Amino acid sequence: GPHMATGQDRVVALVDMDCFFVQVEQRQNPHLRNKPCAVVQYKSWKGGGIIAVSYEARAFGVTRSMWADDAKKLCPDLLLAQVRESRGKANLTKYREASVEVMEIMSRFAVIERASIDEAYVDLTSAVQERLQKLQGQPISADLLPSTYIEGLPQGPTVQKEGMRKQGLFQWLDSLQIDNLTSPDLQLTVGAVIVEEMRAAIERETGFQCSAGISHNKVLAKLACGLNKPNRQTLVSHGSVPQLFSQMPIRKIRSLGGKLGASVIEILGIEYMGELTQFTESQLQSHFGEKNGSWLYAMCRGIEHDPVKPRQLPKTIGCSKNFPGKTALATREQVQWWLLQLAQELEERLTKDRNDNDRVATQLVVSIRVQGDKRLSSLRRCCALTRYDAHKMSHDAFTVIKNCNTSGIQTEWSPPLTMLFLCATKFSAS
DNA sequence: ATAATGACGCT
DNA sequence: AGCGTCAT
Ligand SMILES: Cc1cn([C@H]2C[C@H](O)[C@@H](COP(=O)(O)NP(=O)(O)OP(=O)(O)O)O2)c(=O)[nH]c1=O
Ligand SMILES: [Mg+2]
Ligand SMILES: [Mg+2]
């Protein structure tokens, strides 16, 4: 009762760029704007595998992982841009640099956690505090929230999207407890005002559109972000959670998209996140373990405590290439030459990293996959990273895997290698 | 025959 | 240390 802790302590946003790789290519090539288009890599195999799809092309059913030859059958006017290739592999530099543009702008507003190349969580608790003080006690106008959705509103006794959005925003703002700087709903509202400002800044200064979720934790902010894509932001209040989760499939919640989520569904005999509330914490801990049990108990009530970590820089820098099917590497010099390609890209990226960020990696991780073997990595081995020298790194990486070579013949490699992966890790102040 | 990456848990 | 899960 007077002591129940309701997970309303923070204001957290998740900002995610809309069809990001497509937007980067579309800013550079105006002929691609506002058309169905996709970004692909490796043109030689069925037109390339699609890794990003504009919303106009999604309306025809084009999805990521589709072959471009197959996507053209769904969308004959689909326009393509292809990832740069360097040293015989995909080169994502252009998108990393675009990502840096966005991240630096978000960093001006608050502490951000870089979560992927195109999204970052934002901890707005302090910033909300400040703006509440600066704003006398004056109402929050709907004009401050021109792209915001209030999830679950409108309710109670218009046929177009923007009309619904406004009605719900009006209902929310009409109900707001403005003379109450402690109310979690007021805090989220002010957080949403700031995220409008952050997204306007991103669009003005980069040309890129994005969406955002605003809620009290990372999981809800990420869920909310996807509710009204593209180019829109969604506020998910604590109060919206029971109805939102009542028909929310379990797999849609961050970290439940895989085997854990599948076992939650099968073991408990449930479909929706809200049905989790019927189980005691001990019961959930008995099926899924102490931390997963506790996490599920709180999460299905809308409560989650994972912090927004102050980290804008990756912890690792890695290069990898697949060699599927008959292209699997089978001679030792083939293995050596690719390791050298990977090491040369890694040297470039590390040197830049050291200049910009004043740190050095100190460990090199070599990972390979074998023909027939099932998993992402078949095998990982590590060694010291003492010099950003591509030839040393590729030689060292070879040294530590070369006795994986089951092959008798002096010049062959068996089993064939279907993946090579070099990763620099364990950064330290430089 | 998606691919290329990245964060982190378990042991 | 080396492996497994989950994600974009
Ligand atoms: C999912 C996914 C995305 N990406 C690259 C390009 C995507 O544009 C960049 C950002 O990912 P996202 O936010 O999951 N997808 P999106 O930005 O293209 O589209 P949306 O507007 O966010 O739904 O992901 C991959 O390279 N492999 C992937 O598996
Ligand atoms: Mg995105
Ligand atoms: Mg994303």
GROMACS .gro file of C-alpha atoms (C1' of nucleotides) and ligand atoms in nm:
model
  480
    1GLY     CA    1   0.000   0.000   0.000
    2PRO     CA    2   0.183   0.310   0.127
    3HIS     CA    3   0.514   0.138   0.039
    4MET     CA    4   0.460  -0.028  -0.303
    5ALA     CA    5   0.745   0.064  -0.542
    6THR     CA    6   0.598   0.129  -0.885
    7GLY     CA    7   0.891   0.175  -1.127
    8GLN     CA    8   0.818   0.544  -1.197
    9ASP     CA    9   1.151   0.678  -1.070
   10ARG     CA   10   1.322   0.774  -1.399
   11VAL     CA   11   1.241   0.930  -1.733
   12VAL     CA   12   1.404   0.722  -2.008
   13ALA     CA   13   1.383   0.757  -2.385
   14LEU     CA   14   1.487   0.526  -2.670
   15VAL     CA   15   1.554   0.713  -2.997
   16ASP     CA   16   1.574   0.498  -3.311
   17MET     CA   17   1.646   0.621  -3.664
   18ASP     CA   18   1.381   0.529  -3.920
   19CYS     CA   19   1.515   0.287  -4.187
   20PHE     CA   20   1.859   0.423  -4.105
   21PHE     CA   21   2.087   0.289  -4.380
   22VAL     CA   22   1.819   0.389  -4.637
   23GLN     CA   23   1.806   0.746  -4.501
   24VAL     CA   24   2.187   0.775  -4.518
   25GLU     CA   25   2.183   0.672  -4.886
   26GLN     CA   26   1.875   0.890  -4.951
   27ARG     CA   27   2.033   1.205  -4.807
   28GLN     CA   28   2.334   1.149  -5.035
   29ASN     CA   29   2.129   1.058  -5.348
   30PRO     CA   30   1.813   1.273  -5.368
   31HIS     CA   31   1.674   1.058  -5.652
   32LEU     CA   32   1.604   0.796  -5.380
   33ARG     CA   33   1.397   1.013  -5.147
   34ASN     CA   34   1.031   0.928  -5.081
   35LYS     CA   35   1.044   0.618  -5.303
   36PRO     CA   36   1.040   0.245  -5.224
   37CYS     CA   37   1.405   0.166  -5.183
   38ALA     CA   38   1.634  -0.071  -4.999
   39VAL     CA   39   2.001  -0.104  -4.914
   40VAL     CA   40   2.174  -0.429  -5.019
   41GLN     CA   41   2.520  -0.584  -5.003
   42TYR     CA   42   2.706  -0.816  -5.242
   43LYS     CA   43   2.533  -0.759  -5.577
   44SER     CA   44   2.646  -1.089  -5.732
   45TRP     CA   45   2.411  -1.323  -5.540
   46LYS     CA   46   2.045  -1.271  -5.634
   47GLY     CA   47   2.093  -0.894  -5.644
   48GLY     CA   48   2.224  -0.879  -5.286
   49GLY     CA   49   2.073  -0.933  -4.944
   50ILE     CA   50   1.858  -0.645  -4.827
   51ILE     CA   51   1.962  -0.499  -4.493
   52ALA     CA   52   1.737  -0.191  -4.478
   53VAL     CA   53   1.400  -0.106  -4.634
   54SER     CA   54   1.226   0.230  -4.675
   55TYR     CA   55   0.868   0.248  -4.550
   56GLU     CA   56   0.739   0.295  -4.905
   57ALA     CA   57   0.898  -0.039  -4.999
   58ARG     CA   58   0.770  -0.205  -4.678
   59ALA     CA   59   0.417  -0.126  -4.799
   60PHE     CA   60   0.481  -0.377  -5.081
   61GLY     CA   61   0.605  -0.643  -4.836
   62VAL     CA   62   0.981  -0.593  -4.887
   63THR     CA   63   1.173  -0.702  -4.577
   64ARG     CA   64   1.530  -0.727  -4.458
   65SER     CA   65   1.713  -1.054  -4.541
   66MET     CA   66   1.516  -1.085  -4.866
   67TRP     CA   67   1.722  -1.121  -5.182
   68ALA     CA   68   1.690  -0.812  -5.399
   69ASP     CA   69   1.585  -1.025  -5.699
   70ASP     CA   70   1.297  -1.154  -5.488
   71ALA     CA   71   1.208  -0.808  -5.351
   72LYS     CA   72   1.183  -0.678  -5.710
   73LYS     CA   73   0.911  -0.937  -5.769
   74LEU     CA   74   0.708  -0.783  -5.486
   75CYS     CA   75   0.798  -0.423  -5.578
   76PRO     CA   76   0.905  -0.384  -5.942
   77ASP     CA   77   0.993  -0.012  -5.904
   78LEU     CA   78   1.216  -0.071  -5.596
   79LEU     CA   79   1.536   0.135  -5.609
   80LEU     CA   80   1.858  -0.008  -5.462
   81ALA     CA   81   2.173   0.127  -5.305
   82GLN     CA   82   2.459  -0.109  -5.234
   83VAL     CA   83   2.693  -0.112  -4.935
   84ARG     CA   84   3.049  -0.008  -5.017
   85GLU     CA   85   3.294  -0.296  -5.062
   86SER     CA   86   3.657  -0.275  -4.952
   87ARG     CA   87   3.911  -0.557  -4.942
   88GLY     CA   88   3.645  -0.797  -5.066
   89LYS     CA   89   3.399  -0.734  -4.784
   90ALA     CA   90   3.120  -0.499  -4.682
   91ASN     CA   91   3.243  -0.160  -4.557
   92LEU     CA   92   2.998   0.010  -4.321
   93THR     CA   93   3.205   0.327  -4.267
   94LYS     CA   94   2.949   0.565  -4.417
   95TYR     CA   95   2.679   0.447  -4.174
   96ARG     CA   96   2.911   0.458  -3.871
   97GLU     CA   97   2.992   0.820  -3.954
   98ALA     CA   98   2.624   0.905  -3.996
   99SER     CA   99   2.565   0.735  -3.661
  100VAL     CA  100   2.830   0.960  -3.504
  101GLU     CA  101   2.645   1.269  -3.634
  102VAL     CA  102   2.326   1.161  -3.457
  103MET     CA  103   2.493   1.048  -3.133
  104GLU     CA  104   2.681   1.375  -3.088
  105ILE     CA  105   2.358   1.575  -3.115
  106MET     CA  106   2.174   1.355  -2.865
  107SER     CA  107   2.472   1.388  -2.627
  108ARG     CA  108   2.408   1.763  -2.600
  109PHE     CA  109   2.074   1.698  -2.422
  110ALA     CA  110   2.153   1.424  -2.168
  111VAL     CA  111   2.347   1.110  -2.080
  112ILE     CA  112   2.304   0.860  -2.362
  113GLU     CA  113   2.371   0.487  -2.392
  114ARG     CA  114   2.468   0.390  -2.746
  115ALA     CA  115   2.261   0.076  -2.802
  116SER     CA  116   2.322   0.008  -3.172
  117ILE     CA  117   2.449   0.184  -3.480
  118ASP     CA  118   2.114   0.367  -3.503
  119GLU     CA  119   1.966   0.397  -3.152
  120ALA     CA  120   2.052   0.524  -2.808
  121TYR     CA  121   1.877   0.532  -2.475
  122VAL     CA  122   1.851   0.867  -2.299
  123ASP     CA  123   1.820   0.925  -1.926
  124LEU     CA  124   1.612   1.243  -1.900
  125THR     CA  125   1.542   1.234  -1.526
  126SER     CA  126   1.777   1.523  -1.442
  127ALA     CA  127   1.686   1.727  -1.750
  128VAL     CA  128   1.315   1.691  -1.673
  129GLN     CA  129   1.393   1.815  -1.320
  130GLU     CA  130   1.568   2.126  -1.451
  131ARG     CA  131   1.300   2.219  -1.704
  132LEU     CA  132   1.024   2.174  -1.444
  133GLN     CA  133   1.196   2.444  -1.236
  134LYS     CA  134   1.249   2.684  -1.528
  135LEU     CA  135   0.886   2.645  -1.640
  136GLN     CA  136   0.710   2.849  -1.364
  137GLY     CA  137   0.400   2.635  -1.317
  138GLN     CA  138   0.256   2.716  -1.659
  139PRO     CA  139   0.054   2.470  -1.871
  140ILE     CA  140   0.212   2.242  -2.128
  141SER     CA  141   0.060   2.328  -2.465
  142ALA     CA  142  -0.017   2.064  -2.726
  143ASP     CA  143   0.201   2.274  -2.960
  144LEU     CA  144   0.503   2.149  -2.765
  145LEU     CA  145   0.420   1.788  -2.864
  146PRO     CA  146   0.344   1.802  -3.238
  147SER     CA  147   0.456   1.442  -3.305
  148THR     CA  148   0.373   1.271  -2.973
  149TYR     CA  149   0.127   0.981  -2.921
  150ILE     CA  150  -0.014   0.897  -2.578
  151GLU     CA  151  -0.046   0.519  -2.580
  152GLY     CA  152  -0.395   0.409  -2.476
  153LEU     CA  153  -0.555   0.746  -2.555
  154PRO     CA  154  -0.807   0.850  -2.669
  155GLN     CA  155  -1.064   0.647  -2.477
  156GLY     CA  156  -1.424   0.697  -2.379
  157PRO     CA  157  -1.755   0.818  -2.527
  158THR     CA  158  -1.173   1.068  -3.538
  159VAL     CA  159  -1.144   0.843  -3.845
  160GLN     CA  160  -0.794   0.963  -3.937
  161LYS     CA  161  -0.456   0.909  -3.773
  162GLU     CA  162  -0.364   1.267  -3.687
  163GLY     CA  163  -0.714   1.318  -3.549
  164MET     CA  164  -0.678   1.028  -3.306
  165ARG     CA  165  -0.330   1.150  -3.208
  166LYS     CA  166  -0.461   1.496  -3.118
  167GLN     CA  167  -0.769   1.374  -2.931
  168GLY     CA  168  -0.550   1.149  -2.716
  169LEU     CA  169  -0.294   1.423  -2.655
  170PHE     CA  170  -0.578   1.662  -2.562
  171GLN     CA  171  -0.724   1.409  -2.316
  172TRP     CA  172  -0.379   1.357  -2.160
  173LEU     CA  173  -0.289   1.726  -2.132
  174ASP     CA  174  -0.638   1.820  -2.006
  175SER     CA  175  -0.590   1.565  -1.725
  176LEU     CA  176  -0.235   1.664  -1.628
  177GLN     CA  177  -0.159   1.753  -1.264
  178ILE     CA  178   0.046   2.064  -1.344
  179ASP     CA  179   0.075   2.180  -0.980
  180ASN     CA  180   0.257   1.863  -0.880
  181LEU     CA  181   0.621   1.852  -0.989
  182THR     CA  182   0.648   1.499  -0.842
  183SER     CA  183   0.381   1.327  -1.055
  184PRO     CA  184   0.540   1.062  -1.282
  185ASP     CA  185   0.296   1.144  -1.564
  186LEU     CA  186   0.398   1.509  -1.558
  187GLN     CA  187   0.764   1.401  -1.565
  188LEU     CA  188   0.711   1.181  -1.874
  189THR     CA  189   0.523   1.466  -2.045
  190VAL     CA  190   0.814   1.704  -1.990
  191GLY     CA  191   1.048   1.429  -2.102
  192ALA     CA  192   0.846   1.408  -2.425
  193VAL     CA  193   0.876   1.783  -2.482
  194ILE     CA  194   1.254   1.744  -2.460
  195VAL     CA  195   1.253   1.446  -2.698
  196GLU     CA  196   1.056   1.659  -2.948
  197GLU     CA  197   1.339   1.914  -2.921
  198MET     CA  198   1.606   1.643  -2.955
  199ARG     CA  199   1.441   1.491  -3.263
  200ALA     CA  200   1.387   1.834  -3.423
  201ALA     CA  201   1.758   1.901  -3.368
  202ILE     CA  202   1.856   1.567  -3.524
  203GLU     CA  203   1.640   1.631  -3.829
  204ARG     CA  204   1.752   1.992  -3.876
  205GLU     CA  205   2.123   1.919  -3.839
  206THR     CA  206   2.146   1.585  -4.022
  207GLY     CA  207   1.840   1.552  -4.242
  208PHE     CA  208   1.758   1.220  -4.070
  209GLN     CA  209   1.414   1.137  -3.931
  210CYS     CA  210   1.375   0.915  -3.626
  211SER     CA  211   1.120   0.782  -3.379
  212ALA     CA  212   1.129   0.766  -3.000
  213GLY     CA  213   0.964   0.603  -2.702
  214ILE     CA  214   0.938   0.783  -2.368
  215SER     CA  215   0.864   0.588  -2.052
  216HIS     CA  216   1.010   0.499  -1.712
  217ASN     CA  217   1.259   0.231  -1.816
  218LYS     CA  218   1.451   0.103  -2.118
  219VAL     CA  219   1.222  -0.190  -2.201
  220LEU     CA  220   0.909   0.027  -2.213
  221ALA     CA  221   1.085   0.308  -2.398
  222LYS     CA  222   1.199   0.059  -2.663
  223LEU     CA  223   0.852  -0.097  -2.689
  224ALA     CA  224   0.693   0.249  -2.716
  225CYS     CA  225   0.936   0.357  -2.989
  226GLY     CA  226   0.803   0.098  -3.231
  227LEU     CA  227   0.436   0.167  -3.169
  228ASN     CA  228   0.407   0.465  -3.403
  229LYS     CA  229   0.698   0.451  -3.649
  230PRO     CA  230   0.793   0.632  -3.866
  231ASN     CA  231   0.882   0.989  -3.764
  232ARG     CA  232   0.665   0.981  -3.449
  233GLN     CA  233   0.720   0.948  -3.075
  234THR     CA  234   0.514   0.757  -2.823
  235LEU     CA  235   0.470   0.817  -2.451
  236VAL     CA  236   0.392   0.497  -2.255
  237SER     CA  237   0.285   0.584  -1.901
  238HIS     CA  238   0.288   0.350  -1.604
  239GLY     CA  239  -0.094   0.350  -1.614
  240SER     CA  240  -0.105   0.234  -1.978
  241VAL     CA  241   0.080  -0.087  -1.892
  242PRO     CA  242  -0.207  -0.322  -1.788
  243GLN     CA  243  -0.406  -0.272  -2.109
  244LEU     CA  244  -0.091  -0.250  -2.326
  245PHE     CA  245   0.045  -0.578  -2.192
  246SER     CA  246  -0.292  -0.758  -2.187
  247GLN     CA  247  -0.257  -0.849  -2.556
  248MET     CA  248   0.117  -0.791  -2.599
  249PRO     CA  249   0.289  -1.110  -2.724
  250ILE     CA  250   0.572  -1.208  -2.493
  251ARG     CA  251   0.832  -1.215  -2.773
  252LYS     CA  252   0.791  -0.842  -2.844
  253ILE     CA  253   0.958  -0.746  -2.515
  254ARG     CA  254   1.334  -0.679  -2.526
  255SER     CA  255   1.530  -0.998  -2.432
  256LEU     CA  256   1.221  -1.223  -2.472
  257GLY     CA  257   1.252  -1.258  -2.852
  258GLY     CA  258   1.461  -1.574  -2.820
  259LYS     CA  259   1.480  -1.901  -2.627
  260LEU     CA  260   1.386  -1.754  -2.286
  261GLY     CA  261   1.070  -1.598  -2.425
  262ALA     CA  262   0.984  -1.924  -2.599
  263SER     CA  263   1.029  -2.119  -2.277
  264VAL     CA  264   0.820  -1.864  -2.085
  265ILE     CA  265   0.538  -1.930  -2.332
  266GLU     CA  266   0.561  -2.310  -2.341
  267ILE     CA  267   0.631  -2.378  -1.974
  268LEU     CA  268   0.366  -2.139  -1.840
  269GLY     CA  269   0.111  -2.187  -2.116
  270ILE     CA  270   0.066  -1.816  -2.185
  271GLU     CA  271   0.076  -1.582  -2.488
  272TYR     CA  272   0.067  -1.226  -2.355
  273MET     CA  273   0.295  -1.034  -2.122
  274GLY     CA  274   0.009  -0.949  -1.885
  275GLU     CA  275  -0.071  -1.312  -1.800
  276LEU     CA  276   0.267  -1.324  -1.624
  277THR     CA  277   0.116  -1.122  -1.333
  278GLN     CA  278  -0.073  -1.426  -1.202
  279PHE     CA  279   0.246  -1.604  -1.088
  280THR     CA  280   0.436  -1.536  -0.767
  281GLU     CA  281   0.800  -1.430  -0.796
  282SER     CA  282   0.915  -1.758  -0.638
  283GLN     CA  283   0.723  -1.956  -0.902
  284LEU     CA  284   0.884  -1.757  -1.183
  285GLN     CA  285   1.224  -1.797  -1.019
  286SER     CA  286   1.167  -2.174  -0.995
  287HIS     CA  287   1.110  -2.209  -1.370
  288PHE     CA  288   1.355  -1.951  -1.500
  289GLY     CA  289   1.611  -1.885  -1.228
  290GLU     CA  290   1.658  -1.616  -0.969
  291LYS     CA  291   1.744  -1.318  -1.190
  292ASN     CA  292   1.513  -1.406  -1.480
  293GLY     CA  293   1.232  -1.486  -1.236
  294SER     CA  294   1.271  -1.154  -1.054
  295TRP     CA  295   1.308  -0.966  -1.382
  296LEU     CA  296   0.988  -1.117  -1.525
  297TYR     CA  297   0.784  -1.053  -1.209
  298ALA     CA  298   0.871  -0.683  -1.216
  299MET     CA  299   0.867  -0.645  -1.596
  300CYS     CA  300   0.512  -0.775  -1.650
  301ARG     CA  301   0.404  -0.501  -1.406
  302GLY     CA  302   0.592  -0.237  -1.613
  303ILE     CA  303   0.890  -0.215  -1.374
  304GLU     CA  304   1.253  -0.257  -1.481
  305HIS     CA  305   1.575  -0.116  -1.336
  306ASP     CA  306   1.851  -0.171  -1.592
  307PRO     CA  307   2.028   0.169  -1.592
  308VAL     CA  308   2.097   0.387  -1.892
  309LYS     CA  309   2.473   0.335  -1.903
  310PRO     CA  310   2.688   0.638  -1.982
  311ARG     CA  311   2.858   0.486  -2.285
  312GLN     CA  312   2.870   0.640  -2.631
  313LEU     CA  313   3.165   0.438  -2.762
  314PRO     CA  314   3.163   0.068  -2.852
  315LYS     CA  315   3.349  -0.164  -2.612
  316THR     CA  316   3.484  -0.374  -2.900
  317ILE     CA  317   3.578  -0.318  -3.265
  318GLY     CA  318   3.540  -0.616  -3.495
  319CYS     CA  319   3.561  -0.724  -3.859
  320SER     CA  320   3.417  -1.049  -3.993
  321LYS     CA  321   3.335  -1.231  -4.316
  322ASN     CA  322   3.132  -1.543  -4.396
  323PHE     CA  323   3.243  -1.801  -4.652
  324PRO     CA  324   2.929  -2.010  -4.696
  325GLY     CA  325   2.878  -2.325  -4.896
  326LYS     CA  326   3.145  -2.403  -5.154
  327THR     CA  327   3.320  -2.070  -5.093
  328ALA     CA  328   3.437  -2.207  -4.756
  329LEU     CA  329   3.810  -2.151  -4.714
  330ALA     CA  330   4.010  -2.466  -4.776
  331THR     CA  331   4.374  -2.367  -4.832
  332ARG     CA  332   4.603  -2.221  -4.571
  333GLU     CA  333   4.708  -1.919  -4.781
  334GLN     CA  334   4.341  -1.849  -4.847
  335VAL     CA  335   4.297  -1.834  -4.467
  336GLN     CA  336   4.607  -1.615  -4.434
  337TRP     CA  337   4.500  -1.369  -4.703
  338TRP     CA  338   4.153  -1.310  -4.560
  339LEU     CA  339   4.290  -1.268  -4.207
  340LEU     CA  340   4.510  -1.000  -4.362
  341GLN     CA  341   4.209  -0.828  -4.521
  342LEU     CA  342   4.024  -0.828  -4.188
  343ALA     CA  343   4.334  -0.705  -4.006
  344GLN     CA  344   4.381  -0.418  -4.253
  345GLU     CA  345   4.026  -0.290  -4.201
  346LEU     CA  346   4.068  -0.333  -3.825
  347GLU     CA  347   4.394  -0.133  -3.827
  348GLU     CA  348   4.222   0.158  -4.003
  349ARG     CA  349   3.931   0.156  -3.759
  350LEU     CA  350   4.154   0.125  -3.452
  351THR     CA  351   4.388   0.408  -3.555
  352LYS     CA  352   4.093   0.639  -3.611
  353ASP     CA  353   3.950   0.522  -3.276
  354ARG     CA  354   4.274   0.605  -3.095
  355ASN     CA  355   4.289   0.953  -3.252
  356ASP     CA  356   3.929   1.044  -3.171
  357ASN     CA  357   3.877   0.870  -2.837
  358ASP     CA  358   4.221   0.850  -2.668
  359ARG     CA  359   4.227   0.481  -2.592
  360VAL     CA  360   4.400   0.169  -2.720
  361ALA     CA  361   4.274  -0.186  -2.744
  362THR     CA  362   4.500  -0.438  -2.574
  363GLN     CA  363   4.347  -0.774  -2.667
  364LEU     CA  364   4.284  -0.945  -3.002
  365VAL     CA  365   4.010  -1.208  -3.034
  366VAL     CA  366   4.013  -1.453  -3.326
  367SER     CA  367   3.695  -1.643  -3.398
  368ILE     CA  368   3.626  -1.897  -3.671
  369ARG     CA  369   3.337  -2.112  -3.785
  370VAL     CA  370   3.380  -2.457  -3.935
  371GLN     CA  371   3.181  -2.631  -4.208
  372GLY     CA  372   2.902  -2.840  -4.060
  373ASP     CA  373   2.932  -2.681  -3.716
  374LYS     CA  374   2.611  -2.513  -3.607
  375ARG     CA  375   2.671  -2.194  -3.409
  376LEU     CA  376   2.773  -1.831  -3.462
  377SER     CA  377   3.130  -1.906  -3.350
  378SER     CA  378   3.283  -2.252  -3.359
  379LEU     CA  379   3.587  -2.135  -3.165
  380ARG     CA  380   3.742  -1.824  -3.003
  381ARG     CA  381   4.105  -1.766  -2.913
  382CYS     CA  382   4.271  -1.449  -2.787
  383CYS     CA  383   4.615  -1.287  -2.788
  384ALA     CA  384   4.783  -0.959  -2.701
  385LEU     CA  385   4.714  -0.655  -2.918
  386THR     CA  386   5.031  -0.449  -2.876
  387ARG     CA  387   5.066  -0.279  -3.218
  388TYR     CA  388   4.806  -0.151  -3.460
  389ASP     CA  389   4.987  -0.332  -3.743
  390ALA     CA  390   4.771  -0.529  -3.982
  391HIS     CA  391   5.046  -0.776  -4.071
  392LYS     CA  392   5.128  -0.843  -3.706
  393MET     CA  393   4.761  -0.880  -3.610
  394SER     CA  394   4.688  -1.116  -3.900
  395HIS     CA  395   5.005  -1.315  -3.830
  396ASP     CA  396   4.923  -1.333  -3.457
  397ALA     CA  397   4.563  -1.434  -3.529
  398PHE     CA  398   4.686  -1.710  -3.757
  399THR     CA  399   4.936  -1.834  -3.497
  400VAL     CA  400   4.660  -1.895  -3.242
  401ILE     CA  401   4.416  -2.082  -3.471
  402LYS     CA  402   4.651  -2.263  -3.712
  403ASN     CA  403   4.639  -2.587  -3.509
  404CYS     CA  404   4.263  -2.605  -3.553
  405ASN     CA  405   4.374  -2.748  -3.890
  406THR     CA  406   4.261  -3.112  -3.874
  407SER     CA  407   4.409  -3.152  -4.225
  408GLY     CA  408   4.707  -3.377  -4.286
  409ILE     CA  409   4.824  -3.211  -4.609
  410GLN     CA  410   5.074  -2.930  -4.552
  411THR     CA  411   4.889  -2.683  -4.774
  412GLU     CA  412   4.519  -2.757  -4.712
  413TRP     CA  413   4.278  -2.645  -4.443
  414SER     CA  414   4.026  -2.885  -4.296
  415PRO     CA  415   3.751  -2.864  -4.195
  416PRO     CA  416   3.673  -2.575  -4.432
  417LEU     CA  417   3.631  -2.238  -4.264
  418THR     CA  418   3.293  -2.070  -4.314
  419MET     CA  419   3.370  -1.760  -4.104
  420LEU     CA  420   3.664  -1.546  -3.992
  421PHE     CA  421   3.617  -1.277  -3.728
  422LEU     CA  422   3.878  -1.041  -3.578
  423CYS     CA  423   3.783  -0.828  -3.277
  424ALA     CA  424   3.986  -0.576  -3.076
  425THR     CA  425   3.879  -0.561  -2.709
  426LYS     CA  426   3.995  -0.447  -2.361
  427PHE     CA  427   4.043  -0.078  -2.432
  428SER     CA  428   4.258   0.132  -2.198
  429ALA     CA  429   4.340   0.501  -2.155
  430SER     CA  430   4.586   0.634  -2.412
  431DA     C1'  431   2.290  -1.842  -4.973
  432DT     C1'  432   2.118  -1.291  -4.522
  433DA     C1'  433   2.567  -1.063  -4.356
  434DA     C1'  434   2.817  -0.783  -4.048
  435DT     C1'  435   2.860  -0.668  -3.610
  436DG     C1'  436   2.793  -0.552  -3.100
  437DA     C1'  437   2.657  -0.619  -2.559
  438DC     C1'  438   2.668  -0.925  -2.210
  439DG     C1'  439   2.576  -1.390  -1.910
  440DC     C1'  440   2.746  -1.828  -1.761
  441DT     C1'  441   3.106  -2.132  -1.636
  442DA     C1'  442   3.934  -1.820  -2.066
  443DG     C1'  443   3.614  -1.987  -2.397
  444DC     C1'  444   3.120  -2.049  -2.498
  445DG     C1'  445   2.616  -1.916  -2.537
  446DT     C1'  446   2.206  -1.579  -2.594
  447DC     C1'  447   2.001  -1.183  -2.791
  448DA     C1'  448   2.005  -0.808  -3.054
  449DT     C1'  449   2.021  -0.439  -3.471
  450LIG     C1  450   1.793  -0.552  -3.799
  450LIG     C2  451   1.915  -0.526  -3.861
  450LIG     C3  452   1.950  -0.397  -3.905
  450LIG     N1  453   2.078  -0.370  -3.961
  450LIG     C4  454   2.121  -0.236  -4.017
  450LIG     C5  455   2.059  -0.126  -4.107
  450LIG     C6  456   1.941  -0.084  -4.030
  450LIG     O1  457   1.892   0.034  -4.098
  450LIG     C7  458   2.032  -0.044  -3.911
  450LIG     C8  459   1.942   0.009  -3.797
  450LIG     O2  460   1.853  -0.100  -3.757
  450LIG     P1  461   1.694  -0.090  -3.714
  450LIG     O3  462   1.657   0.026  -3.628
  450LIG     O4  463   1.658  -0.235  -3.646
  450LIG     N2  464   1.616  -0.102  -3.861
  450LIG     P2  465   1.584   0.042  -3.943
  450LIG     O5  466   1.652   0.160  -3.882
  450LIG     O6  467   1.634   0.008  -4.097
  450LIG     O7  468   1.425   0.049  -3.958
  450LIG     P3  469   1.321   0.100  -3.848
  450LIG     O8  470   1.260   0.243  -3.892
  450LIG     O9  471   1.410   0.131  -3.724
  450LIG    O10  472   1.217  -0.005  -3.818
  450LIG    O11  473   2.037  -0.186  -3.905
  450LIG     C9  474   2.159  -0.474  -3.988
  450LIG    O12  475   2.265  -0.449  -4.045
  450LIG     N3  476   2.125  -0.605  -3.947
  450LIG    C10  477   2.002  -0.631  -3.884
  450LIG    O13  478   1.971  -0.744  -3.849
  451MG      MG  479   1.600   0.210  -3.676
  452MG      MG  480   1.746   0.028  -3.431
   0.00000   0.00000   0.00000
